[PDB]
Amino acid sequence: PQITLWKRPLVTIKIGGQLKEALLDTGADDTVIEEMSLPGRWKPKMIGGIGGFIKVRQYDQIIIEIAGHKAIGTVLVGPTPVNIIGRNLMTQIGATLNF
Amino acid sequence: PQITLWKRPLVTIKIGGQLKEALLDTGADDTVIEEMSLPGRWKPKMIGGIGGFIKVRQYDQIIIEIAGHKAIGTVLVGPTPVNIIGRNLMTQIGATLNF
Numbered sequence: 001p002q003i004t005l006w007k008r009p010l011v012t013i014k015i016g017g018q019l020k021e022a023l024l025d026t027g028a029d030d031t032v033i034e035e036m037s038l039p040g041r042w043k044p045k046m047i048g049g050i051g052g053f054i055k056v057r058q059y060d061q062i063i064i065e066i067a068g069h070k071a072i073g074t075v076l077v078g079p080t081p082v083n084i085i086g087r088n089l090m091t092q093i094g095a096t097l098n099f
Numbered sequence: 100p101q102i103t104l105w106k107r108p109l110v111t112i113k114i115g116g117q118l119k120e121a122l123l124d125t126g127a128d129d130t131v132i133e134e135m136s137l138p139g140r141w142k143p144k145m146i147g148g149i150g151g152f153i154k155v156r157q158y159d160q161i162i163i164e165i166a167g168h169k170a171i172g173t174v175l176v177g178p179t180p181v182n183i184i185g186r187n188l189m190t191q192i193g194a195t196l197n198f
């Protein structure tokens with residue numbers, strides 16, 4: 001679908017079998033999801049943003065559905081104020097910025 | 100144009116008579132530009148992101164050119180690690196997300 005930006009670009013995602021709402025973020029290299037239990041092996045990582053760095057748990061090759069489109073890649077789980085879908089998964093579903 | 104997300108979506112912007120590179124961020128509600136001596140009246144504000152909040156100076160009715168497209172709105176100036184063009188300005192150049 002073509003998404004305008006008058007409102008935050010929020011979409012429904014399915015992760016670990018459960019439904020969540022996330023923000024399509026072109027300014028995020030990675031995908032960061034709020035703290036949750038996810039079946040899998042993880043490794044600690046640190047990511048940075050506008051206010052600084054946060055510790056996250058890195059999960060590889062996770063199957064996630066973003067607005068009905070399937071993607072399989074890295075998902076970081078930690079104390080983010082909001083769930084964000086970064087470029088790593090957006091490229092998988094073929095998202096582009098147009099104007 | 101159509102911008103793919105393999106790399107960070109950076110564009111050239113013109114502000115206060117200066118040319119710089121900025122990141123098109125659909126996950127940013129506001130526009131944040133690196134510290135610069137802009138003339139005019141401003142008001143203190145604190146903006147947050149991943150990691151926390153930073154103090155910025157809010158300037159209204161700022162004329163900016165994003166990739167050859169003129170826009171006008173609020174611009175926050177502060178110690179940001181990178182210039183960020185948010186939704187407030189992206190909606191003015193008719194930018195959309197498509198997948």
Ligand SMILES: CCCC[C@H](NC(=O)[C@H](C)NC(=O)[C@H](CCC(=O)O)NC(=O)[C@H](Cc1ccccc1)NC[C@H](CC(C)C)NC(=O)[C@@H](NC(=O)[C@@H](N)CCCNC(N)=[NH2+])C(C)C)C(N)=O
Nearest residue numbers: 027028029030046047048049050081126127128147148149
């Ligand atoms: C796996 C670890 C290695 C990789 C790791 N990578 C990074 O750290 C890379 C550079 N970081 C990023 O790409 C991060 C997102 C996290 C991530 O993708 O990892 N991007 C970001 O954090 C980008 C800005 C940015 C871009 C590049 C560099 C620096 C900063 N901001 C994303 C962010 C999303 C928002 C929904 C929380 N937006 C904002 O921070 C904007 N804020 C807003 O729009 C607020 N008004 C909303 C706040 C919500 N309200 C509330 N809490 N009451 C701000 C720019 C005006 C590293 N380098 O350590």
